[PDB]
Subunit: 260 residues, 4 copies
Amino acid sequence: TGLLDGKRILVSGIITDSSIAFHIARVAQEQGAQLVLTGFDRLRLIQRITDRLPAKAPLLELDVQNEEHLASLAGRVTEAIGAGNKLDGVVHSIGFMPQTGMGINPFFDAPYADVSKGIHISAYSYASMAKALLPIMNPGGSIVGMDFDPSRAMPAYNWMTVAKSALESVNRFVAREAGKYGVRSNLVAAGPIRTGALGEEAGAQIQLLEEGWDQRAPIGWNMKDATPVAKTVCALLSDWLPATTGDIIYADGGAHTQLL
Amino acid sequence: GLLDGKRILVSGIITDSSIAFHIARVAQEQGAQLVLTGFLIQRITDRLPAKAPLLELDVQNEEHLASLAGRVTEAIGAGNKLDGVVHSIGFMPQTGMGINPFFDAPYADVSKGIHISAYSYASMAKALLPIMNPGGSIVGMDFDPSRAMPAYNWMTVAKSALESVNRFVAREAGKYGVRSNLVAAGPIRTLAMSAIVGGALGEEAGAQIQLLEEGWDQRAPIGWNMKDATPVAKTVCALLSDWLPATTGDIIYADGGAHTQLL
Amino acid sequence: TGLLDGKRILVSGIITDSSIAFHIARVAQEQGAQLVLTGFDRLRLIQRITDRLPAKAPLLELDVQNEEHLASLAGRVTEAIGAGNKLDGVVHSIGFMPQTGMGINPFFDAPYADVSKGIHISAYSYASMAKALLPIMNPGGSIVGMDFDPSRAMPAYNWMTVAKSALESVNRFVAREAGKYGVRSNLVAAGPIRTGAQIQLLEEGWDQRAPIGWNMKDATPVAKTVCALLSDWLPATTGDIIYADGGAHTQLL
Amino acid sequence: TGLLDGKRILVSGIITDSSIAFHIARVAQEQGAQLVLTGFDRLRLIQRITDRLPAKAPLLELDVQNEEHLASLAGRVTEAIGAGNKLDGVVHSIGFMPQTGMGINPFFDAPYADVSKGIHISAYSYASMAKALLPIMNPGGSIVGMDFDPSRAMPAYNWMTVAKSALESVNRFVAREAGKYGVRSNLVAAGPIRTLAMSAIVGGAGEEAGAQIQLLEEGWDQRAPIGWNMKDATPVAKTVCALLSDWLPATTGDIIYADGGAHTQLL
Ligand SMILES: NC(=O)c1ccc[n+]([C@@H]2O[C@H](COP(=O)([O-])OP(=O)(O)OC[C@H]3O[C@@H](n4cnc5c(N)ncnc54)[C@H](O)[C@@H]3O)[C@@H](O)[C@H]2O)c1
Ligand SMILES: NC(=O)c1ccc[n+]([C@@H]2O[C@H](COP(=O)([O-])OP(=O)(O)OC[C@H]3O[C@@H](n4cnc5c(N)ncnc54)[C@H](O)[C@@H]3O)[C@@H](O)[C@H]2O)c1
Ligand SMILES: NC(=O)c1ccc[n+]([C@@H]2O[C@H](COP(=O)([O-])OP(=O)(O)OC[C@H]3O[C@@H](n4cnc5c(N)ncnc54)[C@H](O)[C@@H]3O)[C@@H](O)[C@H]2O)c1
Ligand SMILES: NC(=O)c1ccc[n+]([C@@H]2O[C@H](COP(=O)([O-])OP(=O)(O)OC[C@H]3O[C@@H](n4cnc5c(N)ncnc54)[C@H](O)[C@@H]3O)[C@@H](O)[C@H]2O)c1
Ligand SMILES: CNC(=O)CN1CCN(C(=O)C[C@H]2CC[C@@H](NC(=O)Cc3sc4ccccc4c3C)CC2)[C@@H](Cc2ccccc2)C1=O
Ligand SMILES: CNC(=O)CN1CCN(C(=O)C[C@H]2CC[C@@H](NC(=O)Cc3sc4ccccc4c3C)CC2)[C@@H](Cc2ccccc2)C1=O
């Protein structure tokens, strides 16, 4: 008997087998969930990756910047799961920020066109996905999105931090709408996951930043392992956190609760 | 079950309306083997679906705390350890919460309230961590004290202290591969809460506590049922399980999402 | 002998005499500051409003969505204050969110083009203004922006709440850059000020929660708070938020 | 023509000229405030220290654990400032946690009697002082207490962190009461300042606690976008005076961070 036995769950965001969404999908299938997967742009490449999951699952195209894909999504999901069936879970594991808004580029040098594209994909799309899928979600259902704690500024993350701050606010509003359907909406704020290319300076800054989690975390933090993050997402998709919504669960080894 | 084969200590049962009674019931339904602590309680624990040894524990008693691990080992058998610990203990004299002005609470009463409600979370962890397995979990009960509110007064201060204690307990528990977290629940109609709504503290506090309570279901996007402790007991069992393995020194809100909404 | 004696301060965001920026400008002039004002679109109309201030101040055009206005801003400010002089303070009091993402319109019905415009003007522009003006700011200087506490969701504010959450994050990054110039960056989170039914109930719960009360018709306590941050009296506060809300955010009920 | 011209302000917590309260008192006097000072236990020693301030000020005894000192406080202050006059400001700059509740001693080994004494002095006393002084405070008045950000756990501060978490909660309740008098109540969360206790902890008086607190200080100046000078209490004293002034009239039950902005940055 699995944690998600009989649940129908949509999982977005698989691009490689290192994607957090790949591990979420794997754990959900191990726990008896029946999945529907969504992918962006390189669909034939994504299918070769989803072939590595323990079970078969239909793969649907979804570019969150495409209004036609969003308008047809519910109909395409209904065709995949069968008429009369609805989703119990939705996973948003999508993020993007051009190199001008994240990395080595000065914070002030990111043009708004790049920042806006990043915010569209990383934050606004959480509301777009909920709008498209809530009409085909069962009561007791659960929408989960991926977050990286943006309460404090940090080197390199720059405008992606701003996109996460916007995402946390979007999640609180999505919870108000999802509540009308008896559906929960929450984010999982993960520690860094290893999903010299940017030089010596940024490479060192990012290494110190990332090594700080394992030192601060009372139970440690393994950047090579997405499984504890995938398990946390599955806990929110389950019936075991039924009174949590518009909220953030931290799967970061407890690093955010410690100063040093 | 979610907790199949897990050995879990549950404190805080006094009546069958206690949040700890519901936590214990759900944990047994989910396959856990329990050890109960109390400080008349055996007649209540007889109502649980399965038998469980009941040990005496007054958290203000240093002798009870010093002997606790040995008494638990005797109950579960030599060579066996605990996988979970539940702290569901709270107390504040009437001088520190209710109708009494905030400034009129003498320190002796506030201190006793803080000892039982906050310091004892560290005391319980100190006594039980030496007999806990790696991957283990310690969970305590909280009521969001980030903002002041009518009547809760010094109990709000005790919860603010408890949240801080939890972050330090996580540092110690980490050495054993054990997590420590609090569940911040919405209001639940336990014995005291039903008496206050019933008018035991008068018309003024009765009305203030009723507005405090009604605003909760209004703010919660999924609603809030103060008569039902099951969503809170399920949340505690989620933290006792292997499904939140990277969460520690933290707070999970089982409040219908009320704390995320202004209006 | 005022709080801001001799300080050169830029103030954006005046449109009417009920604008929070109008009250900030008035209090700053009363406290001895020499101002430079910026306005958007209706400059002749804005000019007539700024004549109501106690002292004369040059008015410059600034549409924060206009890259040419931003590129020329420092030069235009230098012409207004004189060569060799720099700013000690910058006030960002700008916000906008198209009707689809604010009010009665469902949260899900706001198209991204409207949300993006709102975020550009309300949040990204705080970084744009700091980028343009930090090269003409003196050490010990202060950048202040206006915020409305977005830590919890609420009725009607909808996508403007999302823009404020983005603004708070932008402020923390602007502080990292401003620090290089010995300049502070902070936001003032104000209670509601008079500048449908749900907006009235939301706005009114504020005076109820506030331990010192809240007067939505009076912008002076907010203007005084902004001037406190522009002064030399909060020299160790940056990337932060000061709440001028009657203490409403500290109380549940 | 000072920021606090004509204001009558009570300042507690002076023990040495390194005390944050000494710098608060100095800046307040430079800004035209008329002070009343309170001292604990070593009053002859405290009088020699307060002699170093730019202006004379009456020194009153106040042990916050002493109910008789608290009951007589308002009358003693009234006698010092003159009948018919009231206070405009109150500064709480008091803290203590017995040795077992800090540094080298394991967090689990601090007995409750020590923790309770520490909480009494460091948190409950903020309510005690407000209870005693609000009846002799003018509208527009301000109560300010000193805090050290306890939102996250950290090495060595141990039970003193717990006392600060309790203090932040007490401040929110004090604001509800102070509001009835038209009085504000707020805390200033300061960055680390090399006072006598701070220098001793870094000095190893355990080695491990000294090493961790050295790391805490280094990181603070690193994280702070405007930097942090632990040898300079003046920015902290200025922030307290800003709250005592008429320039933050709509802020109450709140926390102002005078920490160089370090709490707003991860790295
Ligand atoms: N990796 C970490 O350290 C970390 C930490 C915390 C949170 N997260 C978050 O987890 C999520 C997944 O990131 P990841 O680390 O697995 O990286 P990833 O590159 O594997 O996943 C990002 C996904 O976004 C998809 N995407 C981009 N543009 C899209 C569009 N227009 N339409 C639809 N999908 C689009 C990509 O195709 C990809 O599958 C993101 O939200 C990320 O911010 C990551
Ligand atoms: N609305 C609510 O009921 C509510 C909301 C959120 C959290 N909580 C928390 O949940 C926990 C349980 O409260 P409850 O509502 O079930 O009430 P309860 O009265 O049933 O439980 C409190 C328990 O504390 C025990 N206790 C008191 N002093 C003790 C001592 N010296 N030693 C050992 N145990 C002692 C009592 O015996 C009792 O079992 C508390 O921490 C409470 O603050 C309750
Ligand atoms: N009024 C309140 O209740 C309240 C509460 C908290 C914070 N605030 C904030 O204070 C600020 C000022 O708002 P207000 O209430 O004074 O209203 P306002 O309408 O008087 O001012 C908003 C200003 O933004 C300007 N603006 C719009 N588009 C612009 C553009 N492209 N370029 C430059 N400027 C542009 C407008 O011209 C106007 O001057 C905003 O950031 C607002 O969110 C207001
Ligand atoms: N030093 C720092 O790094 C730092 C940082 C942030 C906040 N603070 C806070 O500032 C405040 C002042 O501390 P400090 O660093 O200036 O140290 P300090 O030792 O100079 O001041 C502490 C004061 O508390 C007094 N006190 C102790 N027990 C008392 C009692 N029973 N009754 C009355 N007064 C009593 C002492 O006499 C002393 O004057 C404390 O609340 C402290 O926690 C200090
Ligand atoms: C058709 N409208 C237009 O042509 C342009 N226009 C003008 C006003 N407008 C704005 O963007 C105004 C702008 C909002 C942000 C900022 N003001 C605030 O932050 C103050 C608010 S507005 C609001 C609304 C609901 C709840 C709280 C608050 C609070 C605290 C500056 C002024 C928007 C949204 C709008 C539409 C109709 C009625 C009211 C608003 C807009 O579309
Ligand atoms: C032998 N000493 C005694 O009997 C009495 N005594 C005096 C000083 N004492 C206090 O409680 C001093 C008090 C602490 C709280 C407060 N100071 C601070 O909060 C400043 C600190 S101390 C510290 C330690 C670690 C991390 C941060 C900080 C910060 C920010 C006022 C002064 C304690 C603990 C102590 C002992 C020796 C050296 C240093 C401390 C104490 O036991």
